[PDB]
Amino acid sequence: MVKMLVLYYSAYGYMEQMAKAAAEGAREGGAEVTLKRVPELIDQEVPIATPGELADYDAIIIGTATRYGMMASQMKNFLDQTGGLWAKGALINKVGSVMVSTAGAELALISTQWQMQHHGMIIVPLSYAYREQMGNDVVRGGAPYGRQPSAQELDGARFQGRRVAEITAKLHG
Amino acid sequence: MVKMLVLYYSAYGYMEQMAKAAAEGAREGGAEVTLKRVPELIDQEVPIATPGELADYDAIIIGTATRYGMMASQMKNFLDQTGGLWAKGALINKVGSVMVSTGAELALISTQWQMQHHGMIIVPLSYAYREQMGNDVVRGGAPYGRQPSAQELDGARFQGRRVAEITAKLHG
Amino acid sequence: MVKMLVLYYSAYGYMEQMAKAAAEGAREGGAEVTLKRVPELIDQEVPIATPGELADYDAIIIGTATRYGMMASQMKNFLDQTGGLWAKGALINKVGSVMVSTAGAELALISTQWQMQHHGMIIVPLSYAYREQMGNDVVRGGAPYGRQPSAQELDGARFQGRRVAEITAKLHG
Amino acid sequence: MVKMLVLYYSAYGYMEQMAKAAAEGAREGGAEVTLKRVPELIDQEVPIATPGELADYDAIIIGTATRYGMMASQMKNFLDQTGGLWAKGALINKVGSVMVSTGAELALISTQWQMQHHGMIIVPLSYAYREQMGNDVVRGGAPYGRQPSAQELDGARFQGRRVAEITAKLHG
Numbered sequence: 158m159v160k161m162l163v164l165y166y167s168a169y170g171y172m173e174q175m176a177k178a179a180a181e182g183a184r185e186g187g188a189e190v191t192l193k194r195v196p197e198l199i200d201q202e203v204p205i206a207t208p209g210e211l212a213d214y215d216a217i218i219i220g221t222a223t224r225y226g227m228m229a230s231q232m233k234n235f236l237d238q239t240g241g242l243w244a245k246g247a248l249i250n251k252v253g254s255v256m257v258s259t260a261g262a263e264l265a266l267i268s269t270q271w272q273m274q275h276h277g278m279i280i281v282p283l284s285y286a287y288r289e290q291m292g293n294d295v296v297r298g299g300a301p302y303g304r305q306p307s308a309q310e311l312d313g314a315r316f317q318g319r320r321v322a323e324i325t326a327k328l329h330g
Numbered sequence: 331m332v333k334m335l336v337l338y339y340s341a342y343g344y345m346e347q348m349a350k351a352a353a354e355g356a357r358e359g360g361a362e363v364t365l366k367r368v369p370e371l372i373d374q375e376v377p378i379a380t381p382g383e384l385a386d387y388d389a390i391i392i393g394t395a396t397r398y399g400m401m402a403s404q405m406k407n408f409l410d411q412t413g414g415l416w417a418k419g420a421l422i423n424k425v426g427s428v429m430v431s432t433g434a435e436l437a438l439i440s441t442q443w444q445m446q447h448h449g450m451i452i453v454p455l456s457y458a459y460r461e462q463m464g465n466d467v468v469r470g471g472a473p474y475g476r477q478p479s480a481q482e483l484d485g486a487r488f489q490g491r492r493v494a495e496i497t498a499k500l501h502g
Numbered sequence: 503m504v505k506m507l508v509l510y511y512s513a514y515g516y517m518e519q520m521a522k523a524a525a526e527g528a529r530e531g532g533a534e535v536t537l538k539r540v541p542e543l544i545d546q547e548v549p550i551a552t553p554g555e556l557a558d559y560d561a562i563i564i565g566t567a568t569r570y571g572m573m574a575s576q577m578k579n580f581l582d583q584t585g586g587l588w589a590k591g592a593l594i595n596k597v598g599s600v601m602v603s604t605a606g607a608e609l610a611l612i613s614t615q616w617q618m619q620h621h622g623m624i625i626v627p628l629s630y631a632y633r634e635q636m637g638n639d640v641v642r643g644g645a646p647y648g649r650q651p652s653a654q655e656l657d658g659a660r661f662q663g664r665r666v667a668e669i670t671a672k673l674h675g
Numbered sequence: 676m677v678k679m680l681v682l683y684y685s686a687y688g689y690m691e692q693m694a695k696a697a698a699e700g701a702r703e704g705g706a707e708v709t710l711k712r713v714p715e716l717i718d719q720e721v722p723i724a725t726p727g728e729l730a731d732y733d734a735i736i737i738g739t740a741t742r743y744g745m746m747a748s749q750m751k752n753f754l755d756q757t758g759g760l761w762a763k764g765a766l767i768n769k770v771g772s773v774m775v776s777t778g779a780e781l782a783l784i785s786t787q788w789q790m791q792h793h794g795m796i797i798v799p800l801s802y803a804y805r806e807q808m809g810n811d812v813v814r815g816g817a818p819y820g821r822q823p824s825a826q827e828l829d830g831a832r833f834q835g836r837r838v839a840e841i842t843a844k845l846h847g
């Protein structure tokens with residue numbers, strides 16, 4: 158099995174739920190998933206991650222709450238202490254993906270993906286067209302969509318997780 | 331073999347050379363490569379691409395000249411005519427990569443934005459490796475010194491081959 | 503009186519209404535306002551603008567519809583033909599401001615403001631804190647807020663226009 | 676006189692020199708200038724600034740060193756502690772400007788983002804003038820040639836004075 162790290166920062170519990178969704182989706186993708194959160198400057202049942210352990214995974218999904226469109230200082234400060242890993246090129250060709258929350262945050266997405274790109278990580282974006290197709294799909298199936306994540310957002314997170322998982326699996330097998 | 335499109339816009343021939351380098355590297359990666367340029371609004375021997383043919387490739391490398399840090403209008407206007415492909419989701423899970431020439435970070439971000447919204451899998455530059463290269467070629471006995479330098483061309487080749495191999499692994 | 507140009511691109515009539523609001527607000531700011539739209543690649547009573555006329559105004563407000571978070575090709579193509587003006591430095595120290603529509607578009611705002619910045623134009627941003635204060639204000643006054651622009655958005659546009667106008671007036675008097 | 680704060684973060688002394696240049700230029704613009712640096716997480720003779728004092732100035736110039744194209748964490752962490760000032764709207768209509776050192780367009784965009792959301796009036800670089808400068812000093816008889824060059828320092832000074840005069844006009 159490929160190993161995936163779901164690393165998140167949640168200020169109000171939203172991004173945590175999104176992260177759990179992504180992790181579940183990734184487990185359904187046949188990956189060994191570990192859920193962790195970044196240090197502070199809330200579910201304590203979730204272990205706190207270290208910057209140096211990121212090289213121990215084949216894929217890394219980063220999700221973070223946002224403040225007025227920018228990265229949360231916690232996630233950015235966490236990723237800033239991965240200079241050694243960068244110097245080694247330890248994260249090169251590892252699969253990565255980013256989730257952001259505004260509970261629009263394009264700048265945050267760009268910044269997080271910037272830090273991930275400079276590590277040489279392969280980036281898996283959102284499936285936008287599919288995510289707008291989803292409403293029509295669930296309408297056809299007989300169950301239309303309609304601070305706390307909706308069903309559509311969670312489904313999107315799950316799908317994202319599984320997609321990243323399968324892609325990683327393809328890259329290792 | 332996986333099929334790759336090296337699509338470029340060059341205002342003065344720089345990005346054309348970079349594109350040829352990338353295409354060569356991709357050929358060395360065991361990929362079937364097609365080199366094409368976007369329409370205007372100088373090498374006429376290089377075929378002009380159509381927006382709708384992008385779905386016919388397993389991987390797409392986009393290189394563009396930049397103006398004061400932004401995307402060239404040609405490339406953006408070309409990519410703006412892929413609305414149908416987006417609606418179909420024709421480019422989802424296709425491997426992509428971006429080269430930019432003049433710093434032009436904003437252009438990189440915009441091009442990668444358009445490629446991301448198509449759901450394309452993005453392959454970035456190997457930055458740490460790109461600083462390692464100087465020391466490498468110094469150890470080898472051949473240090474690096476309008477027209478791309480040897481280091482930049484080698485970087486383009488490496489990028490192309492990397493994308494090629496990644497695509498091959500994703501399709502094999 | 504200071505002269506202001508309200509230049510806009512509207513695909514579906516939203517940004518046009520926002521632009522009219524901004525223009526009215528600017529007139530209330532004591533400025534001589536001219537409303538224009540960029541060429542195509544819809545109110546034909548509104549004159550089409552030329553790239554070279556931008557130097558004839560003390561202030562320029564740019565509003566544009568957005569496509570998946572990016573600038574509309576019309577506005578960008580229009581601003582791309584102002585190379586001569588840039589070469590002269592004709593727009594240096596002229597007051598500028600940007601409105602964007604998604605009928606979030608942070609990247610579009612950044613790009614438009616990028617083109618305006620490289621001309622050396624003085625940038626007047628949105629009054630964010632005031633714009634969230636506005637709801638509470640109109641609630642206190644006895645008239646709470648609640649494809650087609652809402653009352654709050656139009657009021658924001660008007661306020662923006664007047665603010666830009668007064669700032670420009672201060673810079674010329 | 677209008678009051679201006681030149682707030683900077685320097686990792687290796689470059690942005691410190693740029694900041695001194697900007698402060699000098701602003702003094703020549705008839706402004707009362709205070710030079711300060713952000714806290715850490717080398718010149719101890721330069722006073723350390725507090726997040727809440729930013730409202731005491733008519734104009735604020737922010738200069739910061741950059742790391743791989745992004746904002747330095749120090750400056751961003753400092754500006755993140757101005758939530759109260761934002762809630763009050765204390766920095767609305769105050770004149771602002773940004774200098775960045777290494778291309779670092781993303782850092783410029785982020786810093787200007789934080790300054791914009793405070794409602795600060797933004798004064799950019801004079802780019803066309805900054806390419807005019809070389810030809811100017813060539814005509815004058817003194818062509819330009821880790822430590823900022825004469826052209827960069829002159830640019831910093833010009834920026835400072837420009838911001839100063841603009842602020843003075845906005846308060847006069």
Ligand SMILES: Cc1cc2nc3c(=O)[nH]c(=O)nc-3n(C[C@H](O)[C@H](O)[C@H](O)COP(=O)(O)O)c2cc1C
Nearest residue numbers: 236237238239240243272273275276457686742743
């Ligand atoms: C996530 C991340 C990405 C980085 N990307 C680059 C890079 O693209 N180019 C580079 O020269 N250094 C990069 N670095 C290294 C830093 O920019 C910095 O040069 C290094 O950590 C040493 O910094 P210092 O000696 O000034 O403390 C990166 C570091 C991190 C943590």
Ligand SMILES: Cc1cc2nc3c(=O)[nH]c(=O)nc-3n(C[C@H](O)[C@H](O)[C@H](O)COP(=O)(O)O)c2cc1C
Nearest residue numbers: 285286409410411412413416444445447448569570
């Ligand atoms: C490169 C590209 C990316 C696009 N990404 C999105 C997207 O992420 N979400 C979306 O709703 N539409 C997306 N579109 C579709 C456009 O937003 C637009 O709706 C389409 O071109 C037709 O719109 P129009 O009739 O207003 O011209 C994209 C189109 C292109 C060409």
Ligand SMILES: Cc1cc2nc3c(=O)[nH]c(=O)nc-3n(C[C@H](O)[C@H](O)[C@H](O)COP(=O)(O)O)c2cc1C
Nearest residue numbers: 341397398581582583584585588617618620621802
């Ligand atoms: C809105 C705008 C902003 C520009 N900003 C810059 C700039 O910051 N630096 C620069 O060298 N040229 C700038 N230019 C000029 C163009 O980048 C370009 O160099 C010039 O128009 C001539 O281009 P060409 O000879 O390749 O056609 C700007 C042009 C426009 C229209």
Ligand SMILES: Cc1cc2nc3c(=O)[nH]c(=O)nc-3n(C[C@H](O)[C@H](O)[C@H](O)COP(=O)(O)O)c2cc1C
Nearest residue numbers: 224225630631754755756757758761789790792793
């Ligand atoms: C520099 C800066 C800019 C801010 N801009 C905005 C803004 O544009 N809109 C907004 O709602 N809050 C803005 N804020 C407030 C923060 O988003 C945040 O709500 C505030 O710091 C308190 O949030 P917290 O309790 O979640 O930490 C800004 C704060 C700072 C420091």
Ligand SMILES: [Cl-]
Nearest residue numbers: 168169172222
């Ligand atoms: Cl959250």
Ligand SMILES: [Cl-]
Nearest residue numbers: 341342344345
């Ligand atoms: Cl070129």
Ligand SMILES: [Cl-]
Nearest residue numbers: 513514517567
């Ligand atoms: Cl519109």
Ligand SMILES: [Cl-]
Nearest residue numbers: 686687689690
């Ligand atoms: Cl420095």
